Design a protein around this ligand. Structure first.
Ligand SMILES: Nc1ncnc2c1ncn2[C@@H]1O[C@H](COP(=O)(O)OP(=O)(O)OP(=O)(O)O)[C@@H](O)[C@H]1O
Ligand SMILES: Nc1ncnc2c1ncn2[C@@H]1O[C@H](COP(=O)(O)OP(=O)(O)OP(=O)(O)O)[C@@H](O)[C@H]1O
Ligand SMILES: Nc1ncnc2c1ncn2[C@@H]1O[C@H](COP(=O)(O)OP(=O)(O)O)[C@@H](O)[C@H]1O
Lengths: 906, 303, 48, 49, 384, 213, 54
């Protein structure tokens, strides 16, 4: 440290720690006297650079501060940075660290502030040279180790980040602001940013998201594509690149409300497309929900290869996975045109092959019955629905149904729902139609109507490839003028096709849903069906639905139930979009009534989805307001008010649910809670309001996909035994279902205690019984999620009928609706060319460790489990493929996706 | 109200129903009860000096993750657990642990096998966790579990040290203490006469990672302890304390404090203010004679 | 007093006798006749 | 000490006051307590210090 | 962007939640105003102030009870007003009325400084694969500890009673300590951890009350996993010999047999015991069905130690210089606590430099210090 | 299943069961536990149709002997308090008395006099028929694939406990779930017989009773 | 350590909510013994409380 002169080269370094003699006196004097001596300075630049490098190792603040103190002055005091024009410009390389030594190494508040501004200007001017890039680089990849650079290099990088962010907030931009003093754009800093990005991508990760999003343009993202696609395999593997990308969309997913969010995720899709794996491509294309992006990946395998190859099989698998059936319709018919084989290809895309694999899983799952043996009165009705609820999905319980004794003892609305429950035994199955047919041609109209509902449920697993579509059966019934018959028919058609908006299905539903002049309560199903059809894909926000809602309000207000169902139907219709839904909020609000205000708060949730924090706060001010106005005064109306209050509560929960899914998974723990206080609250907000918030909570959890499933449903449940409306229990169980018999051991006991214990009304008893059977599926047959499963950010289309029903007080009429509850997840199996129905091995992981994702890419250690197991729910969801040791390579990466495994054995 | 009130805070009561009046202007703290009742000061490194190599070893491993645990976080290193100070008694093993406590800004909790410190639990097999938890409250702290490893004489056949039995309880806790409220700052400063009489499960892999031997004093180091003591006294000029350190040979840091005291009791008898160079001929001779009269038959400092 | 509490009850009462027997409390014309059935039970400060 | 019974916590509470008043008592022209003990195995580590 | 994505969702949600509950405090009281509001008035007047703490010795079924107060005087009180007699039963601390003593309710209960050692304040921040390698003798500790809590389904198919207990045994440092705390993070049910050195006490009678307690708390707050860390410590640790000794060791053992099992029919108390003195236990302890699958660990083999050493060097700064595989060569059937101490000691060499880098040179040097420990309490040199 | 048939008999008789742990009878100070035993027996005399089940009275019930400096004497006060209540100066008026001892190796000879413990029943190891009976109570309770031998599994085993046969099933049940079988077959039962036996030898599970008092 | 350090502060700031929430949740909290059938027991046990036999 101490000066020991020029005795050897080692002690020259020690000499310049206190006072440099080759950077301070000599150089300073030289610059301030002769200008022939500019030639001597130029040679001495190289020497000066070396002395910095050697003393980088030294970290002490005092011996960088004082040493380079008079050089820091010289910039404006003696040199003035223009006494020899080029020469000070190219000698700004040693002087730039001198400024940083007062910024970061020494902290003097007055100078630390002031010289930040100076650093920005000189960074820009020296990046013209392109040597400011090289200045950054020697510290980014390092040459020496010291604590100092670890705080310092960031400051250089921060100059760029500063200005670019400021141009959005303050419209004036450029160097007009004195907060940077550097121009925002122009060909002098733009080339600096590109070069900087290159070095920082290789070694770091830091400044790359700040730059793209701060420009605010998709253009920034499209520059990124170029650099990364080079890097895809030689620099590092495909996998490392995928983890590098998906996050541009994810940190900044929640962080894109509609117009930006779509434009950024377009680019990520394209990056994946460019790279080797098309498997990553399909996942992002589904995400966007655009028809256009789906087609391009499907075409990419199908069209170029003339031969059948792997390519046709692979295309069919990829589109099959979404059980919305949106991909299914689009992908069909290309197979027909090409014509290698119609028979294998068409079946494989359709959900017909999913019926067959279910038999293999079922061969394992068998049957254990537990259904209620109660008969007579309302207890007969309870038991007969319960049988269907335990045998959801493909199950064989034919003989019990064929005993027509208990069937005929149902009465009223009970008959309709009894036949509907029979259909859920043969849910997702071609056979089952036979049982329904018997009743349909005999007795009163009530059994005829219930048959049509059951056809709907059964037709879910078979409606593609022109193999017994739901359309075929149900068209005749729509024609028939009876209201019960027609209403039942169009409900079942919507369920079966789900998100598919095929020409025949859509166009049948197109002239209708436009009569509401005639007062019919069960014409809720008119719009309700059409709304269900629309979800799963981008929405036209159809003019048929918007018109009829307004017309209904004009005609009637007597049937409170009718207008409440209608309001929800609009909000569910708009799901699958958010850009266009900003427009329609205004359109609805054009005509103003207090009744119309009820509709608006619902539609606000969908428009504002993919952010909600302006939405959240809004849906809370609303809650306060009823109380606020009566509150204010001391210091026909019935229908309008009630619609008003209820809509808001539903809207609050809905807003939260879509928001929690798409974006960061940690926050989910709290979002359930935004409700616990919401509930305590409403249970608190009005006497009337308490009734609504109870029911909403259960579907909050199911939609939101809470991590915790043990504590919160059970605890809430106890309080709500005392409280009226036993429909609370039904909504809790749809969440609790999980992976069956993990969560659900506690659930059956807890729900069973209140139900068995208390009988004081057979009406109250009925709701409790149905909820219990729903929760469990024998021998872990299937799971239900609201989510797609293909994306865990995703949201289904079949589960939207579940979400609808919790907005109203319980009714016998509502029981008919509740039979439908579709939303199946398939169990993965390793496929072959002969369609092998067994998985070899898999790893399951309860909790992803990887803090290189939210989703957590499944690691490679895992816990090993056997063949032919259901894809586990929460606390099992990350799933890695074990097959690599046995000479097998997955073709279709599976992370705990719905998607069936496919392997190529070598 | 209840949010102006808290546990172990003295309140005034108006007693005819016991209706809370004021918070009191006092507060009890239980950790000072223990610390006082034992009684120990704190020190600096100018009251240890002369085993200046030792101060370097302990400042590395104890002081530097207190001031800056960040460095360790980056390296990725699980910071030191038990750190053994051991050597002949009185060589300022104890005064080093004190000296570090002032600098590190820790409570110097001297533990010593006492149960007089306690009157609310009264054993250390139910006060390992409570001891750790006071030190967590009044964080940071340096827990000086001084295990002498000779206490009792059925307890050394019985466990190799009954103190090491409690040491074993602490140290096992200590293994997952990497995060639970965010890492360590409650250090295990352990001490002993050697580690050949410590249980070999206290010296198992990864459990003890820095081990500090302390020698008897140098002749340069023994002069530096003498010089500290001379600032309390009033000498006569011309007395070299490098001369005194060479009259002595010591074998512990214990010997030179009693040389300094004996010269001022000899000057006390004299009835003159000054300390003279002749007092130090006799004094050096009184301790060196004392040191040999407990080792010719291995007689204790008691009957 | 590595036993029970009984044995420090013994100890409190024993210490009281010693200050009496010889102390700044002095005796007197008071005499101790101590009858015991075995004297090597005793504490040796009661053999004194 | 036991200190698991009410009667020991009485013995102790007096000894804590001796020690505390002995700290108070220092740097005074008094001679700090003369005390005798029969044996050296009733001392506590803090008393003997 | 990978940290941020997590943060952006989770923070904003904790800020909203907090705000929500402030506006909401007032709102609690609004759905009532005489429906519950009135009820509250009625209870209070009954209670008055002070509510005097008693201790309930026993109940009598005629609406009365005998309390003994800690202030001395017993009282024959009446169980009247706002009280269930099913929330009464020996050991309760009760609220008495300050004129005539009636039990108005039970709200007070008071925790022990021994249930404070037992009960843990953490959830383990480390999780599994921090000593990983020997990862097939770990599915004997996750098919009998983790899994019958997680799935009842599997053991319902086969029927019968599901698993009960494990004894972990082997060399020291071979992961036993971390095994127990790594299954407690995954299950998330009440994790008790007690040292065996605290089960040995220097006072009798209290020994058995402590051991009898651990499983009684355990069954109460079921499910529970009780880690008894070190049950090798029951015959090697002992203080005095006249309130220690044989007698005290035998009695604590005897007690522990009733608890596990025994006649109690307590709660779920899976047991995890670490040991290496397994033959200083009873034949009614290492009895089957209080041990089910028992796990033996020996020292890792050469290719296992490569799993171990790559866990430990991920947290450290690396270079292309560092070579793991030659560190493996040197060690030969040694503990993974040995291997964990070389990596901990290698950053001690970094700290000593004050250089932030870790090199191949730092790992080899601390390997020499680790091998010094092993063969120098040895003094034979070459096997005599 | 020493204590298992006394849970079976507690189902059948429906008398009061008052269970004692012998290590529960020892307290901090001596003669405290004297209180406990005396009082417990007199509460049971007032009680009409009751059974006192003496579990695990291997400590507290042990042999009396002299040490002349022990700490065993203080424990042997409560050992005595058990004798003096059983004969009494009055008889047991419907108190049926079980004593459960692991060990007859050490016991009191006046807590094992033959007029107050009356008939005394040695419980034995199951026979080659007796294991077959036990293991049928245990596999009738398990789902197994029919056509098996419960005789076979007993032969394979040496002279052994049924507490092993309760764990032959359950460990075979874990080999059941790893194969991913709802059912249990012969093959998994073989692995399990090997598993338990190897462990028994390694330690010393049988023909060992430990203690001294 | 820029990229990480920012998150580290933001985590601390977050913790400050969790404490505050424990205090607001506990400000308005109620507690019971035995609820609804022992509201009835108040009618009765208040007549009997006036006497002396306890
Ligand atoms: N497989 C491994 N991977 C990572 N760390 C390991 C592994 N094995 C052991 N360790 C580490 O070694 C240290 C001591 O191990 P642990 O306490 O878990 O087990 P043990 O065999 O009972 O040994 P001991 O009781 O003597 O510490 C801990 O920090 C632990 O995480
Ligand atoms: N002979 C048997 N027949 C049937 N089951 C048996 C038999 N022997 C033991 N068992 C099993 O062992 C289990 C526990 O035995 P239990 O605790 O009742 O026995 P014990 O002979 O008193 O031994 P200890 O008292 O030392 O535990 C019983 O529940 C039962 O499943
Ligand atoms: N390094 C030192 N500098 C000055 N005086 C010292 C030094 N070490 C020991 N002493 C003196 O010796 C006394 C005995 O040392 P002490 O700290 O009690 O010992 P131990 O090593 O046994 O913990 C001290 O109180 C002090 O007076």
């Amino acid at each position: 440290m101490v000066d020991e002169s020029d005795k050897k080269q080692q002690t020259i370094d020690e000499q310049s720690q206190i006072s440099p003699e080759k950077q301070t006196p000599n150089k300073k004097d030289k610059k301030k006297e002769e200008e022939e001596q500019l030639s001597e300075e130029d040679a001495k630049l190289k020497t000066d650079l070396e002395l910095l490098v050697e003393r980088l190792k030294e970290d002490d603040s005092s011996l960088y501060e004082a040493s380079l103190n008079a050089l820091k002055e010289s910039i404006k005091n003696s040199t003035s940075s223009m006494t020899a024009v080029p020469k000070p410009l190219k000698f700004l390389r040693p002087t730039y660290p001198d400024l940083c030594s007062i910024y970061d190494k020494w902290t003097d508040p007055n100078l630390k502030s002031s010289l930040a501004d100076v650093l920005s200007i000189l960074a820009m001017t020296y990046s013209e040279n392109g040597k400011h890039d090289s200045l950054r680089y020697r510290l980014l990849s390092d040459v020496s180790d010291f604590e100092g650079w670890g705080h310092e290099y960031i400051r250089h990088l921060a100059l760029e980040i500063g200005e670019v962010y400021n141009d959005q907030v303050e419209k004036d931009a450029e160097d007009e602001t004195s907060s940077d003093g550097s121009k925002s754009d122009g060909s002098a800093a733009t080339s600096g940013f590109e070069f900087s990005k290159e070095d920082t991508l290789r070694l770091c990760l830091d400044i790359v998201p700040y730059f793209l999003k701060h420009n605010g343009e998709e253009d920034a993202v499209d520059l990124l594509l170029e650099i990364e696609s080079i890097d895809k395999l030689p620099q590092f593997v495909d996998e490392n690149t995928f983890q590098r990308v998906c996050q541009y969309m994810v940190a900044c997913v929640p962080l894109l409300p509609p117009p930006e969010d779509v434009a950024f995720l377009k680019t990520a899709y394209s990056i994946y497309l460019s790279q080797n794996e098309l498997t990553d491509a399909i996942a992002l294309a589904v995400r966007l929900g655009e028809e256009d992006m789906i087609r391009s990946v499907f075409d990419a395998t199908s069209d170029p290869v003339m031969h059948k190859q792997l390519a046709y099989i692979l295309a069919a698998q990829k589109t099959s996975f979404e059980y919305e059936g949106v991909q299914d319709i689009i992908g069909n018919g290309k197979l027909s045109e090409h014509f290698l084989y119609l028979a294998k290809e068409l079946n494989l895309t359709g959900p017909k092959v999913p019926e067959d694999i279910y038999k293999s899983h079922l061969d394992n799952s068998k049957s254990v019955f537990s259904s209620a043996g109660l008969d007579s009165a309302q207890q007969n009705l309870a038991s007969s629905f319960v049988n269907g609820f335990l045998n959801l999905g493909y199950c064989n319980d034919k003989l019990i149904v064929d005993n027509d004794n208990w069937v005929y003892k149902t009465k009223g609305d009970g008959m309709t729902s009894a036949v509907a429950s029979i259909g859920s035994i043969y849910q997702w199955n071609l056979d089952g139609l036979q049982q329904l047919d018997k009743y349909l041609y005999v007795d009163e109209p009530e059994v005829k109507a219930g048959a049509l509902l059951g056809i709907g449920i059964s037709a879910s697993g078979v409606h593609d490839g022109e193999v017994e579509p739901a359309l075929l059966l149900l068209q005749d019934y729509v024609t028939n003028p009876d209201t019960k018959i027609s209403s039942a028919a169009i409900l079942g058609l919507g369920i079966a096709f789900a998100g598919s908006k095929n020409d025949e299905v859509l166009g049948l539903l197109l002239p209708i849903a436009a009569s509401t002049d005639l007062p019919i309560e069960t014409a809720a199903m008119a719009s309700l069906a059409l709304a269900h059809v629309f979800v799963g894909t981008c929405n036209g926000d159809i003019t048929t639905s918007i018109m009829d809602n307004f017309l209904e309000r004009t005609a009637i207000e007597l049937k409170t139930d009718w207008v409440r169902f209608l309001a929800l139907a609009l909000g569910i219709l708009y799901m699958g979009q958010g850009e266009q839904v900003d427009d329609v909020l205004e359109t609805i609000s054009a005509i103003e009534h207090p009744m119309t205000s009820a509709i608006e708060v619902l539609v606000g949730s969908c428009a504002y989805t993919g952010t909600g924090d302006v939405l959240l706060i809004q849906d809370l001010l609303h809650r306060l307001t009823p109380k606020n106005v009566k509150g204010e005064e001391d210091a026909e109306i019935k229908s309008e008010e009630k619609k008003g209050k209820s809509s808001d509560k539903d809207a609050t929960t809905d807003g939260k649910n879509d928001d929690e899914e798409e974006e960061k998974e940690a926050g989910i723990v709290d979002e359930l809670a935004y409700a616990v206080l919401g509930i305590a609250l409403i249970a608190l907000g009005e006497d009337i309001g308490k009734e609504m918030s109870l029911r909403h909570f259960g579907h909050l959890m199911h939609y939101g996909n809470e991590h915790i499933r043990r504590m919160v449903p059970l605890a809430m449940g106890i309080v709500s035994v005392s409280d009226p409306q036993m429909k609370v229990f039904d909504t809790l169980t749809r969440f609790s279902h999980d992976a069956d018999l993990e969560v659900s051991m506690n659930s059956i006991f807890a729900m069973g205690l209140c139900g068995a214990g208390t009988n004081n009304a057979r009406l109250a008893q009925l709701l409790r019984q149905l909820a219990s059977y729903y929760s469990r599926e024998q021998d872990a047959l299937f799971i239900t999620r609201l989510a797609q499963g293909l994306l865990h950010l995703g949201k289904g289309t079949m589960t939207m009928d579940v979400f609808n029903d919790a907005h109203v007080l319980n009714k016998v009429t509502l029981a008919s609706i509740l039979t439908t509850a579709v939303g199946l997840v398939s169990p993965s199996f390793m496929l072959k060319h002969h369609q092998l129905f067994y998985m070899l091995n898999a790893g399951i992981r309860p909790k992803f460790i990887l803090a290189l994702n939210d989703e957590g890419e499944p690691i490679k250690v895992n816990v090993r489990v056997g063949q032919a197991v259901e894809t586990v729910g929460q606390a099992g969801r990350p799933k890695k493929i074990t097959g690599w040791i046995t000479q097998s390579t997955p073709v279709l990466l599976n992370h705990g996706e719905r998607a069936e495994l496919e392997t190529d054995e070598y | 109200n209840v949010k102006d009130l808290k546990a172990s805070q003295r309140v005034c009561l108006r007693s005819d129903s016991y209706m809370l009046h004021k918070v009191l202007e006092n507060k009890a703290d239980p950790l000072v009860s223990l610390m006082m009742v034992e009684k120990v000061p704190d020190s600096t490194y100018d009251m240890v000096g002369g085993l200046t190599k030792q101060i370097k070893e302990i400042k590395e491993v104890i002081e530097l993750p207190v001031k800056h645990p960040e460095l360790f976080e980056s390296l990725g290193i699980a910071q030191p657990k038990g750190v053994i100070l051991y050597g002949p008694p009185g060589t300022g093993k104890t005064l080093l642990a004190r000296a570090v406590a002032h600098h590190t800004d820790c409570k110097f909790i001297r533990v010593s096998g006492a149960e007089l410190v306690q009157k609310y639990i009264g054993e250390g097999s139910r006060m390992v966790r409570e001891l750790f938890v006071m030190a967590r409250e009044h964080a940071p702290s340096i827990i000086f579990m001084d295990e002498i490893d000779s206490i009792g004489s059925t307890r050394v056949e019985g466990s190799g040290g009954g103190d090491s039995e409690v040491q074993r309880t602490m140290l096992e806790l200590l293994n997952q203490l990497d995060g639970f409220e965010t890492s360590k700052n409650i250090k295990i400063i352990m001490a002993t006469n050697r580690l050949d009489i410590l249980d070999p499960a206290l010296l198992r892999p990864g459990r003890i990672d820095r081990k500090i031997e302390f020698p008897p004093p140098s002749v340069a180091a023994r002069a530096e302890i003498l010089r500290i003591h001379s600032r309390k006294m009033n000498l006569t000029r011309g007395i070299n304390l490098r001369k005194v350190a060479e009259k002595m040979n010591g074998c512990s840091g214990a010997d030179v404090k009693g040389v300094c005291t004996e010269a001022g009791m000899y000057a006390l008898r004299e009835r003159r203010i000054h300390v003279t160079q002749e007092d130090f001929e006799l004094a050096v001779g009184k301790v060196m004679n004392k040191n040999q009269e407990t080792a010719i038959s291995v007689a204790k400092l008691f009957k | 007093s590595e036993g029970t509490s009984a044995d420090r009850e013994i100890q409190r009462t024993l210490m009281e006798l010693l200050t009496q027997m010889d102390g700044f409390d002095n005796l007197g014309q008071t005499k101790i006749i101590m009858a015991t059935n075995r004297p090597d039970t005793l504490d040796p400060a009661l053999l004194r | 000490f036991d200190a698991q019974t009410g009667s020991d916590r009485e013995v102790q509470r007096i000894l804590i006051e001796l020690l505390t008043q002995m700290d108070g008592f220092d740097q005074s022209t008094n001679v700090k307590v003369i005390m005798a003990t029969n044996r050296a195995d009733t001392l506590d580590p803090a008393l003997l210090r | 962007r990978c940290k941020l994505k997590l943060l952006r969702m989770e923070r904003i949600k904790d800020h909203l939640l907090l705000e929500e509950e402030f506006v909401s405090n007032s709102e609690i009281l609004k759905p009532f105003e005489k429906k519950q509001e009135e009820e509250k008035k009625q209870l209070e007047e009954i209670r008055g102030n002070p509510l005097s703490i008693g201790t309930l010795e026993e109940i009598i079924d005629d609406d009365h009870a005998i309390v003994t107060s800690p202030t001395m005087p017993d009282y024959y009180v009446s169980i009247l007003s706002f009280v269930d007699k099913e929330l009464l039963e020996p050991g309760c601390s009760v609220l008495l009325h300050h004129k005539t003593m009636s039990i108005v309710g039970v709200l007070q209960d008071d925790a022990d400084p021994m249930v404070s050692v037992m009960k843990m304040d953490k959830s383990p921040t480390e999780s599994y694969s921090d000593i990983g390698g020997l990862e097939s003798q770990i599915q004997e500790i996750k098919e009998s500890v983790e899994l019958p809590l997680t799935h009842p389904e599997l053991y319902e198919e086969m029927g019968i009673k599901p698993p009960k207990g494990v004894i972990l045994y082997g060399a020291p440092g071979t992961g036993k300590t971390l095994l127990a705390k790594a299954v407690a993070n995954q299950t998330s049910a009440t994790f008790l951890r007690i040292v065996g050195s605290e089960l040995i006490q220097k006072y009798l009678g209290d020994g058995p009350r402590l051991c009898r307690q651990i499983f009684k708390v355990a069954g109460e707050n079921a499910p529970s996993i009780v880690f008894i860390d070190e049950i090798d410590a029951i015959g090697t640790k002992r203080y005095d010999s006249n309130s220690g000794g044989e007698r005290e060791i035998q009695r604590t053992m005897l007690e522990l047999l009733n608890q596990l099992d025994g006649f109690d029919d307590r709660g779920d108390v899976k047991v995890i015991m670490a040991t290496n003195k397994i033959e200083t236990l009873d034949p009614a302890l290492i009895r089957p069905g209080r041990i089910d699958r028992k796990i033996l660990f020996e020292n890792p083999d050469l290719s296992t130690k490569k799993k171990i050493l790559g866990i430990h060097t991920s947290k450290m700064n690396l270079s292309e210089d560092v070579n793991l595989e030659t560190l493996v060569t040197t060690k030969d059937d040694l503990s993974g606590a040995d291997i964990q101490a070389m990596c901990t000691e290698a950053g001690l060499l970094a700290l000593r430099e004050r250089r932030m880098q870790v090199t191949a040179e730092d790992f080899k040097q601390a390997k020499e210090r680790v091998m010094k420990n092993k063969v120098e309490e040895n003094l034979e040199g070459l096997y005599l | 299943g020493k204590t298992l048939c006394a849970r079976a008999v507690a189902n059948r008789t429906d008398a009061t069961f008052i269970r004692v742990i012998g290590s529960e009878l020892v307290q901090k100070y001596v003669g405290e536990g004297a209180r406990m035993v005396r009082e417990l027996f007199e509460m049971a005399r007032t009680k009409k149709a009751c059974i006192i089940f003496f579990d695990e009275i291997d400590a507290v019930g042990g042999a009396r002997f002299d040490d002349g400096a022990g700490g065993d004497n203080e424990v042997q006060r409560t050992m005595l308090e058990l004798i003096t209540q059983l004969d009494g100066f009055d008889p047991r008026g419907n108190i049926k008395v079980m004593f459960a001892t692991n060990r007859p190796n050490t016991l009191d000879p006046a807590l094992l006099r033959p007029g107050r413990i009356d008939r005394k029943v040695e419980f034995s190891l199951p026979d080659l028929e007796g294991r077959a009976n036990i293991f049928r109570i245990h596999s009738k309770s398990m789902s197994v694939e029919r056509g098996i031998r419960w005789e076979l599994i007993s032969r394979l085993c040496p002279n052994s406990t049924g507490a092993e046969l309760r764990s032959v099933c359950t460990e075979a049940g874990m080999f059941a779930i790893r194969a991913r079988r709802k059912v249990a077959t012969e093959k998994d039962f073989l692995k399990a017989v090997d598993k338990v036996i190897s462990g028994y030898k390694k330690f010393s599970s049988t023909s060992r009773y430990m203690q001294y008092n | 350590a820029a990229p990480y350090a920012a998150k580290l502060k933001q985590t601390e700031n977050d913790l400050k909510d969790i404490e505050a929430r424990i205090k607001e949740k506990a400000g308005v909290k109620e507690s019971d013994t035995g609820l609804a059938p022992s509201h009835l027991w108040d009618i009765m046990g208040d007549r009997q409380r006036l006497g002396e036999e306890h």
